[PDB]
């Protein structure tokens, strides 16, 4: 709704104020080490976190109620939440993409196959897909109801960042050298596919 | 309490009313008037109205719809779902 | 010019006059502070506007209200009628809509009518 | 111990230090000065007498660098680079003649700079960091030899790579900054991969050096290091200290081991007279040296010798304070 400003800080405060008249609003402390990512459902009820310290964070935003959290294997680098299917993925230090439900505070899948640090990664507005980017110079692609690596491409320069857009359609690529942004097209014609992974170096 | 109504849409239960005030506050109570939400204007100038409103047939959503390019989804509690628009 | 808003409310036949500007936290009536109204047993229903939407919540604001009409009781459903639309009608213009939702949905609940006046129109039915 | 002279090295200004490195077999120190200085001068410990300088006009430097410590080079030369998209040798036979290594082909100028570049154990293999992939280039007749495709994506030019105490050979380390992690890479084969592993970049993302491997020994901005042994890389990738060792209450933006890994020094910038140094394997902490009332400061760079015996602090003063350990 874009009332709201979720902040995270590294001594692992979460701060919550107004966007509409710039105040002081509201106050959580349950990480103790740097609060690596703040998300929150699309009907603003349940309020998800993650810290350095392996722990995931499952919230009332109604209330101040300390609803429920989770201890894993690994600090959590990086969190993007997908909203119209209510879920989230979460990147470990493990080299490993697990994949969490938001309703029921389960753990519901683990992904593995990335050598090296995952760095970007983002759903598909569908829901059905997700494309990370490693310095293994892969861009891989995951679908979620198989639980298999569907594609990777293996590049000449390793990406910064990638973005799906909110239409089914581009794929936005952020590269080290040079300075524009290149954009690639989802084919969204056909497919029947499911098939597999290792291939040429 | 407010602001003259034009469009009024009823729940299939005989429990519910919901009605449309002279804002784009759009607001719901009971039967026995316990005013339960009143909820956020009409937006999408290319003034702001209200002009009619249907209850789901579910019993957990509401369409609003004005004179303003806009169209307005809602549930039973407060949130907004989804605006689509031509 | 400073920021300040004014709604009024009205029992039977008192009426009462409110305004709101930013402040240090006084509630006036007349002369006088908000702890002596007389009848002395109902001083609780003008309590009520303050405790059901928090303690705090006035810390840059001032209230001053007044009275004219009415009997003994009827000035007391007043002027808690007056500083209930006059807190509202605060949070309209400076704090955000977000507060406002908060007290309507607030009042609302406890509602024994915070922000309509009763009116009798008698009938045959 | 003993308490030695105080530093006398003292620039006009309040400036600063580029890095610092030793020598070997005669007590010298030597240093790389932003001024466009290039001096290395007399320690005894009571000595700070200057010996000579280097001054070439037409050139700022703007990054340090110690070449070889043994093929035959050591005594006589030494290559710096700065802003400029080449490399100085400097020739003690004094000849220090510029050798324009501006002969990279097309990969040139596609840094920033080369501002971190390390030699190998016998001068045929130079690396040079990028933004990115590291140059391999023989530093005696001037030609790109080879390069390993570091692959990259964050990489916000890696302030420390060094090969290990275990034989050049056997792989070399590049540490990533922003994120912690280690690259290693097999020298003796380019293109191939002995482990990449996760070290902390939750926390710190700080310069080590080479233990040896015997230990490691890693440190943060949270007063905070802990101990990896070397073949905790294999999986689980991720490794665990035996314990974490807390002694300062601020930041730490030094690190330092000693030549046989049993020491670690820890150091940061932020308040004067703050400086600790933890002993290894016996996992203990040296409180005899240093205090916090002590002249220390706000340290930018620290060096111990190939001995590891003494101390060399450069701070944001001007002063290079040196210290028998």
Known sequence: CGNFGFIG??????????????????????????????????????????????????????????????????????????????????????????????????????????????????????????????????????????????????????????????????????????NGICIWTNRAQFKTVSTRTIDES | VYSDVLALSMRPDGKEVAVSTLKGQISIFNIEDAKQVGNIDCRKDISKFFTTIHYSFDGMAIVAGGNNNSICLYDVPNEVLLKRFI | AVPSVQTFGKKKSATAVAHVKAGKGLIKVNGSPITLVEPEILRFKVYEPLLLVGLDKFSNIDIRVRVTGGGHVSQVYAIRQAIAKGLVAYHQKYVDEQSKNELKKAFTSYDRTLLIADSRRPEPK | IVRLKDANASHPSHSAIQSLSFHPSKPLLLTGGYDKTLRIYHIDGKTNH??????????????????????????????????????????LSQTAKIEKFSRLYGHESTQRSFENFKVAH?????????????????????????????????????????????????????????????????????????????????????????????????????????????????????????????????????????????????????????????????????????????????????????????????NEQGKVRLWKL
């Open chain 1, 9 to 178: 800080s590294s001594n692992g405060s979460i701060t919550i104020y107004n966007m509409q008249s710039g105040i002081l609003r509201k106050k959580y402390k349950l990480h103790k080490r740097a609060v690596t990512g703040i998300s929150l459902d699309g009907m603003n009820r349940k309020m998800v976190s993650c810290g350095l310290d392996g722990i995931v964070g499952f919230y009332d935003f109604n209330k101040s109620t300390l609803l429920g959290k989770l201890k894993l294997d690994a600090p959590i680098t990086a969190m993007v939440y997908h909203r119209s299917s209510d879920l989230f993925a979460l990147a470990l230090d493990d080299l490993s993409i697990v994949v969490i439900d938001a309703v029921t505070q389960r753990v519901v899948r683990q992904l593995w196959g990335h050598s090296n640090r995952i760095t970007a990664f983002d759903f598909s507005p569908e829901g059905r897909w997700i494309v990370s980017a490693s310095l293994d110079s892969t861009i891989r692609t995951w679908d979620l109801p198989t639980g298999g690596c569907i594609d990777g491409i293996i590049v000449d320069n390793v990406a910064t960042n990638v973005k799906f857009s909110p239409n089914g359609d581009l794929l936005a690529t952020t590269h080290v050298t040079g």
């Open chain 4, 50 to 91: 200057l010996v000579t300088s280097l001054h070439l006009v037409g050139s700022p430097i703007q990054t340090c660098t110690f070449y070889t410590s043994l093929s035959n080079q050591n005594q006589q030369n030494i290559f710096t680079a700065g802003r400029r998209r080449y490399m100085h040798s400097w020739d």
């Open chain 4, 122 to 314: 016998l001068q045929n293999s130079q690396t040079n960091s990028v933004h990115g992939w590291i140059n391999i280039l023989h530093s005696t007749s001037g030609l790109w030899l080879m390069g390993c495709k570091i692959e990259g994506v964050i990489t916000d030019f890696c302030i420390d790579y060094q090969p290990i105490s275990r034989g050049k050979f056997r792989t070399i380390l590049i540490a990533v900054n922003a994120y912690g992690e280690v690259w290693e890479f097999d020298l003796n084969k380019n293109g191939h991969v002995i482990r990449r592993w996760k070290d902390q970049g939750g926390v710190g993302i700080t310069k080590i050096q080479v233990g040896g491997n015997r230990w490691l020994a890693v440190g943060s901005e949270s007063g905070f290091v802990n101990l990896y042994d070397r073949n905790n890389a294999m999986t689980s990738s991720t490794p665990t200290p035996v314990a974490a060792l807390d002694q300062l209450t601020t930041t730490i933006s030094n690190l330092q081991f000693s030549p046989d890994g049993q020491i670690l020094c820890m150091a940061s910038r932020a308040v004067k007279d703050a400086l600790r140094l933890v002993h290894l394997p016996s996992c203990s902490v040296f409180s005899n040296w240093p205090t916090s009332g002590t002249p220390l400061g706000k340290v930018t760079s620290v060096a111990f010798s190939p001995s590891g015996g003494l101390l060399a602090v450069g």
